Design a protein around this nucleic acid. Sequence first.
DNA 1: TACAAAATTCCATGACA
DNA 2: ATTGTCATGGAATTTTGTA
DNA 3: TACAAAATTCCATGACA
DNA 4: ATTGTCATGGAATTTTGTA
Lengths: 163, 163, 365, 365
Amino acid sequence: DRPQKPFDKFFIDYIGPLPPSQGYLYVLVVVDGMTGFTWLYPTKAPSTSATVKSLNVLTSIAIPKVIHSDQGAAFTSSTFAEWAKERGIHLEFSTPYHPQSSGKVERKNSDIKRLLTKLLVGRPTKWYDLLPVVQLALNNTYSPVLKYTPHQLLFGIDSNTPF
Amino acid sequence: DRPQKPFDKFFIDYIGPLPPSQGYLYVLVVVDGMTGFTWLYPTKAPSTSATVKSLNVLTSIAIPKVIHSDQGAAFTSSTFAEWAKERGIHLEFSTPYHPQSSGKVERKNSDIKRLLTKLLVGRPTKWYDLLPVVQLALNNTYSPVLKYTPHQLLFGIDSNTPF
Amino acid sequence: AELDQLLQGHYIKGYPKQYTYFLEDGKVKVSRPEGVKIIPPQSDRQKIVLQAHNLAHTGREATLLKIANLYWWPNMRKDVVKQLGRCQQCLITNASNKASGPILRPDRPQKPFDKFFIDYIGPLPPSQGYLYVLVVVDGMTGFTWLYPTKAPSTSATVKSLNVLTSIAIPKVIHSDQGAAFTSSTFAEWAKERGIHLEFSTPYHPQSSGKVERKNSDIKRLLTKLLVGRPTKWYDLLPVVQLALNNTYSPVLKYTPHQLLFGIDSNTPFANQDTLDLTREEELSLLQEIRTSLYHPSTPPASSRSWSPVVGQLVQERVARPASLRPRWHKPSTVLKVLNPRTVVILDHLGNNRTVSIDNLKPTSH
Amino acid sequence: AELDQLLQGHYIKGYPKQYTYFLEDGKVKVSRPEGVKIIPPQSDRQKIVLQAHNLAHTGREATLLKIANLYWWPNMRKDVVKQLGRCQQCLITNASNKASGPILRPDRPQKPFDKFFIDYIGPLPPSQGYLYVLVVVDGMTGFTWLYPTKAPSTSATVKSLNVLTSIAIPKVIHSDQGAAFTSSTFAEWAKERGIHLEFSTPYHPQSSGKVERKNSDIKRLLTKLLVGRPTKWYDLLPVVQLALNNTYSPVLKYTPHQLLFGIDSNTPFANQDTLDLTREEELSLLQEIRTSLYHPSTPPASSRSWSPVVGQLVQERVARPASLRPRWHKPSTVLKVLNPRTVVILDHLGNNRTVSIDNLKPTSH
DNA sequence: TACAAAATTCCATGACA
DNA sequence: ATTGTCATGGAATTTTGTA
DNA sequence: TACAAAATTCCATGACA
DNA sequence: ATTGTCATGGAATTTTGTA
Ligand SMILES: COc1cc2c(cc1Cc1cccc(Cl)c1F)c(=O)c(C(=O)O)cn2[C@H](CO)C(C)C
Ligand SMILES: COc1cc2c(cc1Cc1cccc(Cl)c1F)c(=O)c(C(=O)O)cn2[C@H](CO)C(C)C
Ligand SMILES: [Mg+2]
Ligand SMILES: [Mg+2]
Ligand SMILES: [Mg+2]
Ligand SMILES: [Mg+2]
Ligand SMILES: [Mg+2]
Ligand SMILES: [Mg+2]
Ligand SMILES: [N+]
Ligand SMILES: [N+]
Ligand SMILES: [Zn+2]
Ligand SMILES: [Zn+2]
């Protein structure tokens, strides 16, 4: 019906356990459905509690209409449910084991993994400090389709750090 | 030549030794030649030093053109001389033993003595506190000649405490 | 109820016909120039407003703009304003946007000693163990006495004024409401002498302006004398006092000393015009000079001023507002309007307070 | 010499004939409308003035009036003014009576991330052991990030900005000259990212106005949320941030969030006008909205303003002036006039200083 | 019965924390 | 019941000395 | 083609210590 | 090299719904 827009869906996932960096062990992955903008958040555990702390951070900037995720114990929890109900966010879960998401999102959700590994070899202890540089990198990569960066789709401007 | 005016002459003298009041022993007496306005200052000794402290106080208000006094050791001193030279005050001394001053001043310089004694009997220890009330009293007494108070001659107005 | 007949095309006072009022999702909708808006039922409306407003506690336009996104109804701003008038939090937190009316220029005291204004300066750097200066300005002449004290305290003030009031006793002593003077010991001292005490409105130095303006002259002259040297003000006080009492006001064309005495003492550059007149002829020229002094008139009001009306909701500025707390008291009502700048309010709660309008804002809405 | 022929009745440029110039006590005298005055010899004159002036360090008219009591000569005020220009003490102590010219209204940054303005608020009451808030305002949109810190310190600032600059890197960060940002560690962090640092003139918050004005909104909204309750700001910060970024400016008719994103997130009362347009059509309407924002023009100059001229004697306000000390530095000269409100001076002595005119007075005489 | 320049008056600006 | 004030130095105006 | 009242825009005031 | 800003609520103005 209505065309796809930023903040319509936030695809979230956990990555890790990684080697300990500054006493952190996981990355929470938050990609915007429409733009492919990515936010990364370092956590100590793939728990509801950690998710909520992280997403509280993100949702001072913007609140998605829908968060999509797999049926991970942390997301299917009733605390997390009440958390989203408070903010008027609708929760959407992939069926277990056949975890679909948008074609563009997979493309993206895949890059990150590749990028993190290229980083994790040779520098496995220091990955906490490089998260911002990683983020700036993903958000300013040209999409092979559209040929706009996520940065460009979100802000409608060129970025000051281009790749 | 030119008519007599306030601040033309200040007649100064010492009274005491009196009974000790708040550890004070003498009164320095300063009557304006023209108006009969009187200032009293309590001192510990009839010394140059005490005179200077007192007269420094008076001469933040007004500086006389001439101070007249007897040849008391405190006034004939060379410190006191330099003090007056600093301020451009001319020093004037009565011959010793025949100590003349203005007719109006004597009238006044006499009242004070009478007034102080009436006070000193019955209350000889407390005379320090009553000096202001005494002063207000002398300065607001009708002159039998002119029929203006000293207060009136100095300020050109009626006083708020009349006698 | 009042929404059924509207879909039925009937007229309801306030809802312009010519716009079609359809139905979707069980909500009454209207198609407006600005877009498609939901009309909520009357009972729902106050709730809606409160919610819009509570997001950031926004004023009239900023709240309206939020609401206008989703909803329409008639006379929206009316309901918004109604709500803002009832938001405790905004009332006590928001600033004024209305300045107080033009200041008054009280008549100059008529005779010397009619009125003294007094005040303490400091703390200053320790000089001879003294920290404060008591300043006494005669209202009429501007003549000023200075006294150094160890504390801005009643006892000190009495000691100094006992010396001063040997020259003459004033009708009225005017001061600020600092502990020194609001003390019962001071009231008693004054009552012993038939001196009426009179107090500025709290937290308002304009009312003591005749003194406060003189503190500036004192502080400025002392400063200049002290360039280069260590701050040793004690010995300078007398020199400053004499200096100042003997300085011309370019507007009056006289020195305080002149207006008090009608003739110069034996100071530098002493004026000699009256040297030929008897003291009597001098004293009456002085009588006349004093009456004919320049006197300022009050300035024009700024385009957006306000005046106190008896019975007007009004708020008083918080005294020593803590960090993060409201800058204003809850509302209170005007009881008497003493002059257009001073007011009696019934406050918190409920005491009579005589306050200046500079320390009031008219509660809005 | 030049006084002999005057008694002899000869003309001397400047001394009006028609007044008789007699002799008494070996002083040349003249009979004037105002009275009988002594004319001192030229060599004596500067001395006379200095003495009059030194009684209380009085300005032009007040000094003249003293001198006029005893003396006359031609062009008295000329010699007075000459002297006042050379009185070290008055120059560094007296206030200005000339206001600075109208403020400028710098062009709004063109794109988001062109310019961040930053600043610290506090100390606040201890909340969760945090005392300060780092505030970051995007120049173009007004969008604001809040970060709580334990100290207004470089390390803290870096930590917070590392988080922030994941979203995007700015061209320019503008700040005040507080230790946090003037530190070499900060310069280095910025240079690592190709972020240009730019600093307000010292002791002049108008230059950081875009942030400082936002601190007020923050402090005011927090306050309101805290009426009644204990001051627990830590947990509120995010709510205030969201609240504020999503508040309309009645003049712009947009929220910061809108100007940054061109569409509302899933918040209360989210605007739905663009719901029908593709993201592309949205992004270019936004491109156009941003360019066509309201922009203030500079106000008219007050009747008695001043502008900096290259080579003008000028004085800079003393930083943290001690009690009883001069409020102004010795004079210094203007080197470049950067814009009509910012200036480069050669100071004490002699360093180049880039200062605001609000912190300067033009040395008089 | 009129001029330039001096003398005076006007008056916004800022500081009494 | 209580209330702004006034030194300062450019600029605006008025007066002065001379014709 | 002209009205009262609502809607909007104007804009001085004040606060970021 | 650097530079004031903008929410707020009466009041002033413009637009609206109806004739
Ligand atoms: C504006 O902040 C001030 C508060 C002042 C004072 C002065 C100022 C600045 C100011 C000073 C003098 C005159 C004017 Cl006309 C003026 F505007 C005092 O001078 C004073 C006293 O005890 O004498 C007490 N206060 C207290 C707060 O401590 C309250 C009365 C607010
Ligand atoms: C006027 O006195 C102030 C001095 C301020 C600040 C604010 C004000 C009041 C004011 C505040 C904000 C904006 C505007 Cl325009 C404004 F006028 C700061 O906010 C601030 C900072 O470090 O952020 C540092 N200072 C320091 C002195 O400690 C110096 C810069 C003078
Ligand atoms: Mg998972
Ligand atoms: Mg003797
Ligand atoms: Mg006081
Ligand atoms: Mg004071
Ligand atoms: Mg700061
Ligand atoms: Mg600040
Ligand atoms: N009055
Ligand atoms: N600019
Ligand atoms: Zn509110
Ligand atoms: Zn000087």
